[PDB]
Amino acid sequence: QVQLQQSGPELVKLGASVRISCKASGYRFSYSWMNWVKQRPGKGLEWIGRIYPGDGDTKYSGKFKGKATLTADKSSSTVYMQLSSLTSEDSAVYFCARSAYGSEGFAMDYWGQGTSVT
Amino acid sequence: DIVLTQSPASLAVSLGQRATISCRASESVDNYGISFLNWFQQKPGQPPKLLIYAASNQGSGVPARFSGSGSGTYFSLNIHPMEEDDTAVYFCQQTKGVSWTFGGGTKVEI
Amino acid sequence: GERETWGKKVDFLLSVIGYAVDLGNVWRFPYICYQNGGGAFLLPYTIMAIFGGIPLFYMELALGQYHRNGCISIWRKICPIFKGIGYAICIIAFYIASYYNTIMAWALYYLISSFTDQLPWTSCKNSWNTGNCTNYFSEDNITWTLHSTSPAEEFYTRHVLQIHRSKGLQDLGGISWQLALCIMLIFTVIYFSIWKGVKTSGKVVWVTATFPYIILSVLLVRGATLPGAWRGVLFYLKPNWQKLLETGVWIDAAAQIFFSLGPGFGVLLAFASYNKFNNNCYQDALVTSVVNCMTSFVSGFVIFTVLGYMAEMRNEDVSEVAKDAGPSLLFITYAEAIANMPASTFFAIIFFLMLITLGLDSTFAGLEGVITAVLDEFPHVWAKRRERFVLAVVITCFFGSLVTLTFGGAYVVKLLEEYATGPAVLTVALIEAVAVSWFYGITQFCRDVKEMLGFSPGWFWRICWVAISPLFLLFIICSFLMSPPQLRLFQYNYPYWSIILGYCIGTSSFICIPTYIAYRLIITPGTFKERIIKSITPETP
Ligand SMILES: N#Cc1ccc2[nH]cc(CCCCN3CCN(c4ccc5oc(C(N)=O)cc5c4)CC3)c2c1
Ligand SMILES: CN(C)CCCN1c2ccccc2CCc2ccccc21
Structure with missing residues (x-):
């Protein structure tokens, strides 16, 4: 079985920084991506963004490279994303999707609970 | 960055009709034969459970109602006639590099 | 319009040794040299070379240098009925330039796709499945599964070949445009290298045939420096005399030495038909064979020091490490080892550069052979416009090689590799040897060599050309004329109609010989006896 876990909700402060965690278990996590999506209410x-624990290959889109630097800790089976300059627009949930193998079309099979920040 | 145009953005389909959801893009996301694209479903207050691999192959633990077809630019989700339990928002998340993108979502209801 | 001589003597001595070492000496010689003993293979390599590949080489060179009339038009001076050998060798060159430039296209794709600072063989990205990924040895854990495939294998069978989109020879639709425009550049280089004959095909060799050695030296140094070189070199040089008992080692050694020296393929004739008359056709036919053998030996050292490093790192002996065909053995395991080497992105660029250069000059020679043959065959409709008909042969070889570049790819390349080089080419070579030796009296073939060089051939070659070579070619023909073809690449069992297709491909050759024999016997008048005796003797106007 595959299941993911995240941290609890936090508070959105002007210019503050928050570290969203995301665990992983039940599979060799050193070869599957760990996506991150933002579903605003x-x-x-x-x-x-994107990350690949085992090679450090991270991708982003639309200035998210300077706002959310992803980090993968392959020891405790956890991935991080150090947010910064939390604008009032960044008050949303933050899922942690696991991209599947490449042959399946990079399917975001399993999703975390959701670390909503308000 | 690829643009993912979806239409119609709202399907007022009842119980017994086969609804359709289109998903176009600039590409031509067909890569290495396996068309890089997926279909999701976000029920109110739930994570986006996956539906279709590569817009043709079924997901995991999903009934055979949610079919899939299309290749190249026009990808469609011809959902089988369903009941009021499958009222949610359906996204069209491509995966061709280098930066993936999500659709706009097409909420369905009677 | 005389025969355009070479620029220098070295201009031909280098061209012939560039033609010699093409791909056998770079991947097949170690792969065939560890399966057959390891140390008990060099002896049946040398005592088979000296008996069946070097005498044929010297015979081809002396014949081409004395007669100076190419490959298809030399038969009107040797034996009229055997003039079909030229058309047969042209069909053979068509098939082989069809299946041979695909490997160079793959190598050029690897070259142009290795400029990235991080080579695409270490990670595991979209077009490279992850469910069967991870078999790369650069991992601390001992997790392993019989279904897992290394990322280099997925790169070779899912990105360049796209073989996952073809269920075999039953369907191979879709052409790899990224390879279709990649082999076009190679054919352009070929045409722009042999578009003038020899005055440029010799100058190109000055950089295309000596550059593989400059790269092999540094690759051998890097391989010997590797942590675990000796564990592989010892296995490369470990003799197993219990393997020498089986005839398989002798068959493989004979096939390897013949298809590495390449005598009688209508190219050594075309090369020797260019240099001067009084040129020493012995000191260049005796050095090319030993240079080819030493090149195979050094490349075996390189390949197996790399394999020994890989086995020592994977915590497993050299066995059960990349046990597959040649192209896989050079594009998967060696590619992974290069991607794991310290100074990556440099030992891949130069490796693929050398891999394409030691094939470019070989294809240059293989095409120039039949080009010179067809040119000096018809010196009226041709030999005045050589700028043309080279574009024609290149476009013909390209349109024939357009089937090996589809998504099927290796599924047709392996077939044309192990069917177009079967008993057809060997029967052509056997008929050539028995025509130069038995029909054309070897007494004259010694008198002319004596009057050309300055001394008659010794008693070694005098007995070999009549008893050893025509026997060791009949043996190498009857060896796998009965062996069941079981190609089976990439765990894909070939259908039964593939055997009929291979038989028909072989029959495409060796049909021209009886065709022309009948066409020549019908024209000459008289009874059967005089009809034979007429077209056995040379013209001699
Ligand atoms: N017609 C017909 C017919 C009928 C009945 C048959 N049974 C079987 C067959 C064909 C089975 C393959 C025969 N092989 C195998 C390997 N082989 C070879 C070995 C070393 C080498 O080295 C090189 C190189 N350096 O290029 C090239 C090269 C090639 C040449 C021929 C067959 C065919
Ligand atoms: C076998 N190496 C040494 C010869 C060069 C490649 N050569 C080959 C390659 C494999 C088998 C036979 C032949 C005959 C010569 C010929 C003619 C035209 C194009 C390619 C080839």
Whole structure:
């Protein structure tokens, strides 16, 4: 079985920084990506970034590279993303999707609980 | 960055009709034969459970109602006639590099 | 319009040794040299070379240097009925330039796809499945599964080949545009290298045939420096005399030495048909064979010091490490070892550069052979416009090689590799040897060599060309004329109609010989006896 876990909710402060955690278990996590999406309340999902624990290959999109630097800790089976300059627009949930193998089309099979920040 | 246009953004389909959800893009996301694209479903207050691998292959633990077709630019989700339990928002998340993108979502209801 | 001589003597001595070492000496010689003993293979390599590959080499060179008339038009001076050998060797060159440039296209793709600072063989990205990934040895844990495949294997069978989109020879639709425009550059280089004959095909060799050695030296140094070189070199040089008892080692050694020296393929004739008359056709036919053998030996050292490093790192002996065909053995395990080497992105660029250069000159020679043959065959409709008909042969070889570049790819390349080099080419070579030896009296073939060089051939070659070579070619023909073809690459069992297709491909050759024999026997008048005796003797106007 595959299941993911995250931390609890936090508070959105002007200019503060927050570290969203995301665990992983039940599979060799050193070869599957760990995506991150931002589902703002009322609107659709939005892709934040990407990471590949085992090579450090991280991708981003639309200035999220300077706002959310992802970090993978392959020891405790956890991945991080150090947010910074939390603007009032960044008050949303932050899922932690696991991209599947490449042959399946990079399927975001399993998703975390959701670390909503308000 | 790829643009993922979805239409219609709202399907007012009842119980007994086959609803459709289109998903177009600039690419041509067909890569190495396996068309890089997926379909999700976000029920109110739930994580986006996955539906379709590569817009053709079923997911995991999903009934055979949610079919899938299309290749190249036009990808469609011809959902089988369902009941009021499958009222949610369906996204079209491509995966061709280098930065993936999510659709706008097409909420369905009677 | 005389025969355009070479620039220098070294200009031909280098061209022939560039033609010699093409791909056997770089991947197949170690792979065939560890399966057959390891140390008990060099002896049946040398005592088979000296008996069946070097005498044929020297015979081809002396024949081409004395007659100076190519490959298809030399038969009107040797034996009229055997003039079909030229058309047969042209069909053979078509098939082989069809299946041979695909490997160079793959090598050029690896070259142009290795400029990234991080080579795409260490990680495991989209087009490279992860469910069967992770078999790369650069991991601390001992997790392993019989289904896991290394990332280099997925790169070779899912990105360049895209073989996952072809269920075999039953369907191979879709052409790899990234390879279709990649082999076009190689064919452009080929045409722009042999678009003038020899005045440029010799100058190109000055950099295409000596550059593989400059790269092999540094690769051998790096391999010997590797942590675990000796564990592989010892296995490369470990003799197993119990393997020498089986005839398989002798068959493999004979096939390897013949298809590495390449005598009688209508190219050594075309090369020797260019240099001067009084040129020493012995000191260049005796050095090319030993240079080819030493090149195979050094490349075996390189390949197996790399394999020994890989086995020592994977915590497993040299066995059960990349046990597959040649192209896989050079594009998967060696590619992974290069991707794990310290100074990566440099030992891949130069490796693929050398891999494409030691094939470019070989294809240059293989095409120039039949080009010179067809040119000096018809010196009226041709030999005035050599700028043309080279574009024609190149476009023909390209349109024939357009089937090996589809998503099927290796599924047709392996077939054309192990069917177009079967008993057809060997029967052509046997008929050539028995025509130069038995029909054309070897007394004249010694008198002319004596009057050309200055001394008659010794009693060694005098007995070999009549008793050893025509026997060791009949043996190498009858060896796998009965062996069941079981190609089976990438765990794909070939259908039964593939055997009929291979038989028909072989029959495409060796049909021209009886065709022309009949066409020549019908024209000459008289009874059967005089009809034979007429077209056995040379013209001699
Ligand atoms: N017609 C027909 C017919 C009928 C009945 C048959 N039974 C079986 C067959 C074919 C089975 C394969 C025969 N092989 C195998 C290997 N082989 C070879 C070995 C070393 C080498 O080195 C090089 C190189 N350096 O290029 C090239 C090269 C090639 C040449 C021929 C067959 C065919
Ligand atoms: C076998 N190496 C040494 C010869 C060069 C490649 N050569 C080959 C390669 C494999 C088998 C036979 C032949 C005959 C010569 C020929 C003619 C035209 C194009 C390629 C080839």
